[PDB]
């Protein structure tokens, strides 16, 4: 359904749909604020659903699932020249732990989305974005500040959920639409046992293939250095149809945020050069236009921005307030943004392609493909360049 040698992925993530992220849909979290006090705002989907209870959570989420993304979005995605979407989903859509607060019902909409993709010639990865106990302690896993994916029976539960996904979506029924199943989003390598993580990846790979599936297996890089995965899941060992997913941002540390625009561009170009050297097919499964961490709650509920020296002991660089509204951006910031987008596009098209995070947000323009496109900052058509050949690839 895809030729990873000859085709290039040009896609968007459908983030915020099946896994709630406060910065993407702040309207769902803001009713819990008490004036200026954010101490009572639930920090993740786990606590959001727990605080609301099963009845209220399902009522509110059914409204969200039916409106956030619809068939019209898939039409617009196709119309903009995109050929691909990545769909994050949490384990709880398929299986609940005893005492889990989560509600189910996402699978109905996942299956509607697969049909809308078929109708609009869009291909798909299904991405297991959240594992029981959390694989990274990020709020985008469902459960912030916990790192228990490798504890107890949580790895086994994850494999059981993957087997369900493999049987439903890795078979003949969706072979024209599904071009990858991503085993686990962003396992936080530095805090995990990497030998056990590799065993988990291998078990997932073997399990899928054992069902008769030929669907590509997507492994996230676990924040390892370029080339780390070169000797894992290799054709020499009869392991085939494997893709590495690299995520690339320059906003989650003081050092990255303090770079001038030229140095941001140099780093982007180098992502391209280094990815070209790797031995697996690879795709930039997440990246954005952000040059700041200013979006409200990007770092989590009740945490500030490093950019204005309000988090992570970072120095003050600049005030966020002026950057929250794209109509208030300086001409210089608009130009820097366009340069940065084009450099990243060139770097990522140099290997397997790219998947922007994300299609839409309520009010965070740096993270919204729609907003950037409508404001002329994301190239349309996506091959247009105002700043041609910043990287000098050959």
UniProtKB/Swiss-Prot annotation:
Outcome of swapping residue 138 to A: Decreases catalytic activity. Impairs catalytic activity
Phenotypic consequence of gene deletion: Leads to enhanced susceptibility to the commonly used antifungal, fluconazole, during biofilm growth only.
Catalytic-site annotation from UniProt: 186 (proton donor), 286 (nucleophile)
Location in the cell: Secreted, Cell wall
Keyword Protein transport in annotation: no
UniProt activity-regulation remark: Binding of human antimicrobial peptide LL-37 decreases the catalytic activity, which leads to the decrease of cell adhesion.
InterPro entries with a match to the protein in the record: Glyco_hydro_5, Glyco_hydro_5_CS, Glycoside_hydrolase_SF, Glycosyl_hydrolase_5
UniProt key word NAD: no
Cystine connections: 269-391, 294-320
An annotated Gene Ontology molecular function: cell adhesion molecule binding
Induction: Expression is maximal during the early rapid growth phase and increases during biofilm growth. Induced by caspofungin. Transcripts is also regulated by RCK2, SIT4, and HTG4.
Outcome after substituting residue 252 to A: Impairs catalytic activity
GO biological process: adhesion of symbiont to host cell; cell-substrate adhesion; fungal-type cell wall organization; glucan catabolic process; glucan metabolic process; single-species biofilm formation in or on host organism; single-species biofilm formation on inanimate substrate
Documented EC number(s): 2.4.1.-, 3.2.1.58
Similarity-based family: Belongs to the glycosyl hydrolase 5 (cellulase A) family.
Subunit organization: Monomer. Interacts with the human antimicrobial peptide LL-37.
Protein name per UniProt: Glucan 1,3-beta-glucosidase
Gene: XOG1
């Amino acid at each position: 359904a895809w030729d990873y040698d000859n085709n290039v992925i040009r896609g968007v993530n459908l983030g915020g749909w099946f896994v709630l992220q406060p910065y993407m849909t702040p309207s769902l979290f803001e009713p819990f604020q008490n004036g200026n006090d954010q101490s009572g705002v639930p920090v993740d989907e786990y606590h959001w659903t727990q605080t609301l209870g099963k009845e209220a959570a399902l009522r509110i989420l059914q409204k969200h699932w039916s409106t956030w993304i619809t068939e019209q979005d898939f039409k617009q995605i196709s119309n903009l020249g995109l050929n691909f979407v990545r769909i994050p989903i949490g384990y709880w859509a398929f299986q609940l732990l005893d005492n889990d607060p989560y509600v189910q019902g996402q699978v109905q909409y996942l299956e509607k989305a697969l049909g809308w993709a078929r109708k609009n010639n869009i291909r798909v990865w299904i991405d297991l974005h959240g594992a029981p106990g959390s694989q990274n302690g990020f709020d985008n896993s469902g459960l912030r500040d916990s790192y228990n994916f490798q504890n107890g029976d949580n790895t086994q539960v994850t494999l059981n959920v993957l087997n369900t996904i493999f049987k439903k979506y890795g078979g003949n029924e969706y072979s024209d639409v599904v071009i990858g199943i991503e085993l686990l989003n962003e396992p936080l390598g530095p805090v995990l046992n990497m030998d056990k993580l590799k065993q988990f990846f291998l078990d997932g790979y073997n399990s899928l293939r054992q069902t008769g599936s030929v669907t590509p297996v997507i492994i996230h890089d676990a924040f390892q250095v370029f080339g780390y995965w070169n000797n894992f899941l290799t054709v020499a060992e009869g392991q085939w149809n494997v893709v590495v997913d690299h995520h690339h941002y320059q906003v989650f540390s003081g050092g990255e945020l303090s770079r001038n625009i030229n140095d941001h561009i140099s780093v982007a170009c180098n992502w391209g050069w280094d990815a070209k050297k790797e031995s697996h097919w690879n795709v930039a499964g997440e990246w954005s236009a952000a040059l700041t961490d200013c979006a409200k709650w990007l770092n989590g509920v009740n945490r500030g921005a490093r950019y204005e020296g309000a988090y992570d002991n970072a120095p003050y660089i600049g005030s966020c307030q002026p950057l929250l509204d794209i109509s208030q951006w300086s001409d210089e910031h608009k130009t820097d943004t366009r340069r940065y987008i084009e450099a990243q596009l060139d770097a990522f098209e140099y290997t397997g392609g790219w998947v922007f995070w994300s299609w839409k947000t309520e009010n965070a323009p740096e993270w919204s493909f729609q907003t950037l496109t409508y404001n002329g900052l994301f190239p349309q058509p996506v091959t247009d360049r105002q700043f041609p050949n910043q990287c000098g690839f050959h």
